[PDB]
Amino acid sequence: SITPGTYNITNVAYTNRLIDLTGSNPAENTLIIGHHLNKTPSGYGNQQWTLVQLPHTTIYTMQAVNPQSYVRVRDDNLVDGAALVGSQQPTPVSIESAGNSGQFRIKIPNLGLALTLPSDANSTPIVLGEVDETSTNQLWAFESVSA
Amino acid sequence: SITPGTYNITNVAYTNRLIDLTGSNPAENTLIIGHHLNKTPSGYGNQQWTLVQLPHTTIYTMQAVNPQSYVRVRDDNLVDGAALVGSQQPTPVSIESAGNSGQFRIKIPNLGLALTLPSDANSTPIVLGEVDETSTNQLWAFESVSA
Ligand SMILES: CC(=O)N[C@H]1[C@H](OCCN=[N+]=[N-])O[C@H](CO)[C@@H](O[C@@H]2O[C@H](CO)[C@H](O)[C@H](O)[C@H]2NC(C)=O)[C@@H]1O
Ligand SMILES: CC(=O)N[C@H]1[C@H](OCCN=[N+]=[N-])O[C@H](CO)[C@@H](O[C@@H]2O[C@H](CO)[C@H](O)[C@H](O)[C@H]2NC(C)=O)[C@@H]1O
Known part of the structure; x- marks a missing residue:
């Protein structure tokens, strides 16, 4: 499983879209979106x-670097379509390798829901979607930020 | 939420019953059961x-001190009535205070299921049951182990 650490996380369908907390805004419920890299090398x-x-499980918390908002399903509403947002508290996620290259699904534990990017349009908010076998938009790649 | 550490866990409905790994058996799929305290003062x-x-969630792993088997739902079959067993791999659980005091429910994350002890007979296996706020069979007291 992915080692604890700091990453740029890019969509597999839309490889030029990173997970991005809108406007680096520390406010609750700030949306999390798919967005072009905003600064080389790692944003x-x-x-x-x-x-x-x-340990010994695929459950993780995901926290941005600055501001330090965690990834959270808005209002803890774990249902299809629900928005991902920046919060002072996290939603635990299950990050699971897809049979793939170094590709992963970021899943809501035990619900069969996953983070998806529904469009390549810049700034498209990321939402939950149903886990499936053929959609690449709920697939994600992770790249370490250089120390 | 409960502080990490090592605990004796006693059922609320059946106060002479502790979660117990059958026969200190290190084998996979060994039943977890309710059973009287087997040694003073902490078994x-x-x-x-x-x-x-x-951190910052209520998700946890539970592992016995000896042998070091984790608490796992049999075949990761997260449904009503499924058996709790020891395993080399754990089922992440959500240990949530049930108001009261020192009382907690050990729930399956995001599902309406929780560890429950159906009878005070010695060695009754612990199994998942639907979450039910009024049922003491799925309530648990946690006592730090002095040993
Ligand atoms: C609404 C908002 O936050 N807009 C801009 C913000 O302007 C704030 C003032 N008024 N407005 N109205 O400015 C930031 C910083 O330039 C800007 O942030 C970018 O937002 C995009 C999505 O639109 C993406 O999140 C970028 O990564 C982000 N860049 C930074 C550095 O935060 C925001 O859109
Ligand atoms: C038979 C065997 O291989 N193990 C038994 C063990 O046998 C001792 C030999 N016969 N004598 N006197 O005996 C213990 C009971 O003392 C038994 O372990 C207990 O099993 C119960 C449920 O069946 C429960 O898990 C108890 O906590 C457990 N106690 C300990 C200390 O492991 C074991 O199966």
């Missing part, structure tokens, strides 16, 4: 995500 | 459970 802090892992 | 290692926590 500002709002496109870097630190993963903390529960 | 042997099969009745002592170490909790590991993912």
Whole structure:
């Protein structure tokens, strides 16, 4: 499973879209979106995500670098279509390798829902979607931010 | 939420019953059961459970002190009535205070299911049951182990 650490996380369908906390805004419910890289080599802090892992399981918290908002399903409403947002508290996620290259699904534990990017349009908010076998938009790649 | 550490866990409905790994058996799929305290004052290692926590969540792993088997739902079959067993791999659980005091429900994350002890007979296996706020069979007291 992915080692704890700090990553740029890019969509597999839309490889030029990173997970990005809108406007580096620390406010609750700020949306999390798919957005072009906003600074080389690894973006500002709002496109870097630190993963903390529960040993011997695939459960993690994801926290941005700056501001330090965690990834959270808005209002803890774990249903299809629900928005991902920046919050002072995280939603635990299950990050699971897809049979793939170094590709992963970021899943809501035990619900069969996953983070998806529904459009390549820049700034498209990321939402939950149903886990499936053929959609690449709920597939994600992780790249370490250089120390 | 509960502080990480090593605990004896006693049922609320049946106060002479602790979560216990059958016969201190290290084998996979060994039943977890309700059973009287097997040693004073904190039982042997099969009745002592170490909790590991993912910070800022209520998700945890539970592992016996000896042998070191984790608490796992049989075949990761997260449905009503499924057996709890020891395994080399854990089922992440959500340990949530049930108001009261020192009382907690050990729930399956995001599902309406929780560990429950259906009878005070010695060695009755612990199994998942639907979450039910009024049922003491799925309530648990946690006492730090002095040993
Ligand atoms: C609404 C908003 O936050 N707009 C801009 C913000 O302007 C704030 C003032 N008024 N408005 N109205 O300015 C930031 C910083 O330039 C800007 O942030 C970018 O937002 C995009 C999505 O639109 C993406 O999140 C970028 O990564 C982000 N860049 C930074 C550095 O935060 C925001 O859109
Ligand atoms: C038979 C065997 O291989 N193990 C038994 C063990 O046998 C001792 C030999 N016969 N004598 N006197 O005996 C213990 C009971 O003392 C037994 O372990 C207990 O099993 C129950 C449920 O069946 C429960 O898990 C108890 O906590 C457990 N106690 C300990 C200390 O492991 C074991 O199966």
